Design a protein around this ligand. Sequence first.
Ligand SMILES: NC(=O)c1ccc[n+]([C@@H]2O[C@H](COP(=O)([O-])OP(=O)(O)OC[C@H]3O[C@@H](n4cnc5c(N)ncnc54)[C@H](O)[C@@H]3O)[C@@H](O)[C@H]2O)c1
Ligand SMILES: NC(=O)c1ccc[n+]([C@@H]2O[C@H](COP(=O)([O-])OP(=O)(O)OC[C@H]3O[C@@H](n4cnc5c(N)ncnc54)[C@H](O)[C@@H]3O)[C@@H](O)[C@H]2O)c1
Lengths: 336, 334
Amino acid sequence: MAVKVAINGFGRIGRLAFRRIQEVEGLEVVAVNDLTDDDMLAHLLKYDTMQGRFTGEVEVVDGGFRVNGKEVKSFSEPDASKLPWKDLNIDVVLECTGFYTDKDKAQAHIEAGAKKVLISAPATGDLKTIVFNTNHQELDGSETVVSGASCTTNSLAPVAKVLNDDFGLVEGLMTTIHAYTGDQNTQDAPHRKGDKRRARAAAENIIPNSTGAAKAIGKVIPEIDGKLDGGAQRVPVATGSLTELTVVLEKQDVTVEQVNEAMKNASNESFGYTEDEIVSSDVVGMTYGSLFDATQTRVMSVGDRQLVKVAAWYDNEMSYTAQLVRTLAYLAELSK
Amino acid sequence: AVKVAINGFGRIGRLAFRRIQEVEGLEVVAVNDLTDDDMLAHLLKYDTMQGRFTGEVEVVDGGFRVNGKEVKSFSEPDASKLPWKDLNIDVVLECTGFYTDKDKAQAHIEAGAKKVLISAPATGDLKTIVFNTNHQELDGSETVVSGASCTTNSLAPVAKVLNDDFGLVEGLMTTIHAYTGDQNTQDAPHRKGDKRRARAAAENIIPNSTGAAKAIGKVIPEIDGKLDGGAQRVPVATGSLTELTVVLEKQDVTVEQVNEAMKNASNESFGYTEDEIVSSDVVGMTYGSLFDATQTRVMSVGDRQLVKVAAWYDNEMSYTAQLVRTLAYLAELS
Ligand SMILES: NC(=O)c1ccc[n+]([C@@H]2O[C@H](COP(=O)([O-])OP(=O)(O)OC[C@H]3O[C@@H](n4cnc5c(N)ncnc54)[C@H](O)[C@@H]3O)[C@@H](O)[C@H]2O)c1
Ligand SMILES: NC(=O)c1ccc[n+]([C@@H]2O[C@H](COP(=O)([O-])OP(=O)(O)OC[C@H]3O[C@@H](n4cnc5c(N)ncnc54)[C@H](O)[C@@H]3O)[C@@H](O)[C@H]2O)c1
């Protein structure tokens, strides 16, 4: 009956993927895997610094833990191949560890016994990369492994599409003012990936860092492949981010009114429209994958030449999770 | 020595006092704010971001004493009622934020002082000065002057190199900027009705308007109307970054062309770095702007290109160094 989901890596996205699936019919989290015991998991689910107390009742039992009456088998196998997926009849695995961001790598879940895997990040290898309500239609059924893209890709894609579909994108650069993440250091320290900037203190700094989101957009919107590039500035807020896209268009004499009105026509559950003057903390916990802020739309014109600047908010945590669970639930209902 | 009185002993005003303590022929003789001397001495001694001031300070009669030199303290909202003639003030450093206009600032002149330098952008017919970019514009005849903003001082040199070497066509700007005293600590009604600055400064990415890029023709007249853009207020107490996305005239442009052209125009005001630095690495730097060469990025789709560069700046000290730099030159023309 219900689709059996296992969340591998019960961290920020795993825990939020969990909170989201409670209120989704025919989608059930039966298993959860991490590198810690049930006691820490139950607690980190109950309490969230940025997102707030879990609405239901998390209670810890033998093996796993019970949420609102139902039990969830918890594990701590670092080797995904060794997890009891076939025994549990797992239909889909939410790969949220950040260590299986490759088609061949994530195959360990399929080797373990899962039918499908969805990775909560951009992934190397031959697979579809799915931003929901932008290209979830390219999913047909045959898929064993799928990438849920990055948070920034989910914020960028729907604005990137409206821009090219309606105006004809010549080229563009993107910079995202981003909240800090787990991969960053609390203090000045040697970094695991050798990055000298993620090495720096996340909460006391403006930190530049590279992101694929812009350069990798061709995987999601093939028609604009290799028209966007750019990176990120990482700033001291614990969640919530903003994408800024500066573009050159084919249509001349483009006005500010046009750009905003075109975004409002393209608004769904995934791509929001706001004319209110909000800040990063106002989007904390929002379920829009991308929220177009109409007040930040700017157009430079020196004669018959234009530059078009736009901005979209995204709670890199919840915003992305909402999209991932959407992408997940769709992929699952595509199996019969 | 040139007699200087500081109006607005704030973040710019107090750091300006530290900056002048090492400029010979320039002596701070008076200071005016809205608080008592017991407080004025304490905030000089102690800085949160910048650090314990190196001289020694004492509270005295009618002022306070720094390294033996005595500074006169005053507290007059109406800058009109200040004894600038009594003290023979040559230049008033205006750092309150309330006299950011030519007709407004002509109060220090009425008071008795000869000149005024505004620590901010100012309305009215007056020269806006970024040091080492157009301070030569000042011939000495000026009665009131503007030292521009922090972002204008970060932008100006980067922009001049871009136009002069490759030809500026048009461009846009984002400045990831440190939060400032005009912002609120908690979500509260704003003095000027700004719904975004009305918000808790230290816990938000707050987008805000800025005239740094828009009014750049005031400093670089050849490129007027070509730049525009905004700011992003983020929870760092000091340190900021200007992001410029420009279209250029020259074709087939390489990143390595841009960096080399920027290393060539480097000086006391305009630094050049290839180290992968962050916000805090510029706290207290005396460069008005520091060009980060790691951040130069160039987009090319066929024959059409988009060039992006980023410049670091301590909005407090980078600006102050530039402001005091401008003060000395404006002073030696007397
Ligand atoms: N945090 C965000 O805003 C954001 C947004 C979108 C996508 N992502 C992506 O999601 C993934 C996870 O992100 P996060 O922020 O949740 O990080 P996180 O550190 O909170 O999550 C890592 C979790 O996985 C666990 N883990 C690590 N190795 C494991 C192993 N091999 N086996 C089982 N568990 C393991 C860790 O203990 C931790 O609980 C990354 O790929 C990241 O890029 C993050
Ligand atoms: N802080 C920055 O990074 C920055 C950078 C460049 C320029 N500026 C400009 O400098 C000016 C001051 O900035 P700040 O950050 O130092 O602000 P601040 O609040 O620290 O300084 C204001 C100071 O002026 C005093 N003051 C206010 N009204 C007064 C009155 N009329 N008479 C005498 N004193 C008065 C206040 O008590 C306070 O000490 C502003 O124009 C600002 O835009 C600020």
